[PDB]
């Protein structure tokens, strides 16, 4: 069950720059006193992050796009940030991920939950006793067919509401690479009331969850102390981009500083010489400045269907000693239609990979056609021999094409 | 498990005895990517996962890095830089019964190709034409999950083939699943062939004093040297140096 929250005040959010935050360890192998260059999804230095904060009655938790990597930061005083939700549609139609820190444990659930617009954790405070006890928890309306579940070690927190300036800074990095959801984090005590501190961060790896789901939507849970109050909280959301860093490792195995390779010409020289100190002179720089963000596709402007139905169901189908060559022209080759009703045994492709077959445009295409027995399917290949590839049908050594074979015991063979 | 929603099981804190498996089970295609089958025994693996799905005989080739089809674009895609072994065998007697086994399903139609190791469980209606289906079946509106028709009277292409795909990560992070090789004594300060946690080589070892991180188990001060390693038996931090100094 969920309900709309009243007395909501609308104010435009602020944008501030992150002073060298959001970098993590790319690998778990130990090194020391060396400089390592890496290419991974990283938040670029001095980028706009979203200053979201509470107190009048300032409450905010919008739905943000994921955009292949999210860096999160939070200035914490009295345990307001409790978790996040990730997904695609957030309405139990797609797979969803939920990370929450409830009153005694930490729960990570990958399931098809249905979500309301304003999820919250409600903490209630009593006049008669000074103890703060968790009372309310509304993030999902109901449950469905669950896939992954994880419950941490039980513990207790500081549930009281401290006053004054914030005392902690907890940083997180979420990314999804090769079906793996990698979470990096570190927490540093701070003394600030409304500021993002100027200090380097070394986010250690925490979990590599093997979830492997589509993800494009993100939202942050909050805790509040139909009257209600929001309390004091502030968090920061930024997005990771494909960049190149150079990390300097100290003698203790922890990283010291990271030199961007696409921010400054001095940083460009530091990247192209792979060192943090450069002398005077002229240093030609390798090109790391620009990364394209758009794609354009232009093809011949004809959308007829190719006669694959004539080739693949030919009812009378050619022999092997006198095979048929059919020219295909002025149409489109929709491969997705072919395997709807036909199963191919050996889809061997020479010179062209099957993955990059869709985006190509063919110029001189011909469709050979013959019937062979099951033992001679291997003979239709460049470099094979036998009584089929020597006397009946020989393929060239520099072949470029795809061999498509299937079973036709029901069609091409009859009794007697 | 089915192929649209396959199962991932984590295996940890045990030993992987390969010799038990082929005592009573015969594997059709033991394709291995990145790791040779001969050197599988002396390795000790770190992060393993056992995928599980049933496919027909013609689509066994589709579970491979770089292959395409309706099982490697819409159901289960393997990454390009895969490191592991694909274990498939015939299961016509177990997974197929008379009258058709309709429990197994697969995504016949999908809007876009899957990312590597990504699971899709949604059952939303796919629109074939430009008309909107609006969540109800009609013309050019089909259920995306079609059912297999496994029957014991069909051919080799139309019978189930249980596929278990293992994914490893060799010689990075601490390891929990090792091979069936037996451990021997350690001869330090002498030239000897070592097999520390699957890392084979020849060179002398001494005692080092640097401290590792809790999530780090190996170390290479300079790459292609492999100087640092921890002894699994004693948890003594050491160093790996070449057999003799080169200054002769």
């Amino acid at each position: 069950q969920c309900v709309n929250l009243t007395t909501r005040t609308q104010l435009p959010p602020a944008y501030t720059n992150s002073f060298t935050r959001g970098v993590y360890y790319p690998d778990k192998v130990f090194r020391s006193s060396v400089l390592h260059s890496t290419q991974d999804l990283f938040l670029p230095f001095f980028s706009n992050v979203t200053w979201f904060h509470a107190i009048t009655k300032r409450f905010d938790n919008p739905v943000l796009p994921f955009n292949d990597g999210v860096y999160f930061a939070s200035t914490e005083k009295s345990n307001i940030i409790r978790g996040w939700i990730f997904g695609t549609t957030l309405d139990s139609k797609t797979q969803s991920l939920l990370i929450v820190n409830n009153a005694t444990n930490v729960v990570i659930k990958v399931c098809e939950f249905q979500f309301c617009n304003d999820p919250f954790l409600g903490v209630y405070y009593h006049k008669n006793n000074k103890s703060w006890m968790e009372s309310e928890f509304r993030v999902y309306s109901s449950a469905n067919n669950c896939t992954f579940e994880y419950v941490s070690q039980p513990f207790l927190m500081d549930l009281e509401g401290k006053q004054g300036n914030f005392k902690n800074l907890r940083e997180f990095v979420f990314k999804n690479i090769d079906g793996y959801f990698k979470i990096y984090s570190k927490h540093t005590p701070i003394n600030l009331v409304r500021d993002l501190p100027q200090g380097f961060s070394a986010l250690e790896p925490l979990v590599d969850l093997p979830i492997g789901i589509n993800i494009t939507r993100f939202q942050t849970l909050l805790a509040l102390h139909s009257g209600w109050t929001a309390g004091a909280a502030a968090y920061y959301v930024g997005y990771l981009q494909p960049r190149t860093f150079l990390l300097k490792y100290n003698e203790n195995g922890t990283i010291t500083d990271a030199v961007d390779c696409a921010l400054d010409p001095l940083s460009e020289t530091k990247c192209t010489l792979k060192s943090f100190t450069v002398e005077k002179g002229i240093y030609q720089t390798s090109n790391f400045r620009v990364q394209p963000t758009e794609s354009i596709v232009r093809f011949p402007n004809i959308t007829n269907l190719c006669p694959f139905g004539e080739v693949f169901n030919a009812t009378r189908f050619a022999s092997v000693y006198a095979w048929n060559r059919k020219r295909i022209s002025n149409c489109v080759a929709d491969y997705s239609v072919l395997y709807n009703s036909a199963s191919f045994s050996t889809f061997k492709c020479y010179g062209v990979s099957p993955t990059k077959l869709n985006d190509l445009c063919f110029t001189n295409v011909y469709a050979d056609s013959f019937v062979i027995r099951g033992d001679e399917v291997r003979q239709i290949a460049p470099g094979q021999t036998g009584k089929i590839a020597d006397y009946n049908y020989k393929l060239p050594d520099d072949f470029t094409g795809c061999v498509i074979a299937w079973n036709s015991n029901n069609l091409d063979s009859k009794v007697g | 498990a089915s192929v649209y929603a396959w199962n991932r099981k984590r295996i940890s804190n045990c030993v992987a005895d390969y010799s038990v498996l082929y005592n009573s089970a015969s594997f059709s295609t033991f394709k291995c990517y990145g790791v040779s089958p001969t050197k599988l025994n002396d390795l000790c693996f770190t992060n393993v996962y056992a995928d599980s799905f049933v496919i027909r005989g013609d689509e066994v080739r589709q579970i491979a890095p770089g292959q395409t089809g309706k099982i490697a674009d819409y159901n289960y895609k393997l990454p390009d830089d895969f490191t592991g072994c694909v274990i498939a065998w015939n299961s016509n007697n177990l997974d197929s019964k008379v009258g058709g086994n309709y429990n197994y399903l697969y995504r016949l139609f999908r809007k876009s190709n899957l990312k590597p190791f990504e699971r899709d469980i949604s059952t939303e209606i796919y629109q074939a034409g430009s008309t909107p289906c609006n969540g109800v079946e009609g013309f050019n509106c089909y259920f995306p999950l079609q059912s297999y028709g496994f029957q014991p009277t069909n051919g080799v292409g139309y019978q189930p083939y249980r596929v278990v795909v293992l994914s490893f990560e060799l010689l990075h992070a601490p390891a929990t699943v090792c091979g069936p090789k037996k451990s021997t004594n350690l001869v330090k300060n002498k030239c000897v062939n070592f097999n520390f946690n699957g890392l084979t080589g020849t060179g002398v070892l001494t005692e080092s004093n640097k401290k590792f991180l809790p999530f780090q188990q190996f170390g290479r001060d300079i790459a292609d040297t492999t100087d640092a390693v921890r002894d699994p038996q004693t948890l003594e931090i050491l160093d790996i140096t070449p057999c003799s100094f080169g200054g002769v």
Partner: antibody
Amino acid sequence: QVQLVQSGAEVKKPGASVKVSCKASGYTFTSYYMHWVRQAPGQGLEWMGVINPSGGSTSYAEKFRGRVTMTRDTSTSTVYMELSSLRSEDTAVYYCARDREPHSDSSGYWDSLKYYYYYALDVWGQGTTVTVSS
Amino acid sequence: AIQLTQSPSSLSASVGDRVTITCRASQGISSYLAWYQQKPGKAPELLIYAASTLQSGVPSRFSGSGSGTDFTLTISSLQPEDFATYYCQQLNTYPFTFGPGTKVDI
């Protein structure tokens, strides 16, 4: 070394509340949890509650939930325990023991997934004797 | 809940020998174990934490081992001051439960 002093022996009718106090000395009051152990005469130990002193948050056993109030006084630096509806089987001795795991004034409980938590009752008090009878 | 059973309930030994005591768990506990020693008329003291690690300020004659549902404690060169009650405690989930207790006599 640290010295922990509990309250004296108290006798009362088993139909009212009891007041037990502990006062750890030589250790940061807020860091470690303050575990509570009841021992019956001629019986083994049992765990009844844990106190996160800085938070004031507490966790009871599932058998004794809702009948025991476990509070703190950080101004006078003591841990208080009160039990309602005493029975004849509650005639026992009470120990209040700190737990080994230390913490800071922060929810690094996020790091529960990095480092495993092992709790150990290393330092024990001298105990108090609570005897009730009709 | 989770219950732990120590076997045997009654133990008899001498001074200067090696003795072995064990306790069996119901479900999976992994490495969450506390071995506690309590002298009669005295408060209990922590002896072994995490089932394989010696606690500081304790002599190394005591040792502990075990995994899964089985746990054991080995006593070598048994001093006359070691005649005390032993408990094994599991810390998997709430609530934390103690063992029954083993008594050893001269």
